[PDB]
């Protein structure tokens, strides 16, 4: 089946991501970023307080249903 992940915005908006455990989280970052209308290099994704790479998967990070991912912004100096 699909694993329902959750994204918690810094404003309060909740985004539910319906993806599979074999499905790379890379598309997750891009999909959300596309909706924001910005470069993926401007934001940062964190899971369990650790930054996520473009080579990680839900089944690789031992993620479960309702797992929330944090989305921050990079410092512009």
């Amino acid at each position: 089946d699909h694993i329902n992940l959750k994204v918690a915005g810094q404003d309060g908006s909740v985004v539910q991501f319906k993806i599979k455990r074999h499905t790379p989280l890379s598309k997750l970052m891009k999909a959300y970023c596309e909706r924001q209308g910005l470069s993926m290099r401007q934001i940062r994704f964190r899971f369990d307080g650790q930054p996520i790479n473009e080579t990680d998967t839900p089944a690789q990070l031992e993620m479960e249903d309702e797992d929330t991912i944090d989305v921050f912004q990079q410092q512009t100096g």
Binding site: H2, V7, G12, S13, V14, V15, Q16, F17, K18, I19, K20, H22, T23, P24, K27, L28, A31, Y32, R35
Partner: peptide, 12 residues
């Protein structure tokens, strides 16, 4: 409030 639903499919 605001709720967003995104579904991504991967093909291999």
């Amino acid at each position: 409030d605001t709720a967003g639903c995104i579904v991504i499919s991967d093909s291999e």
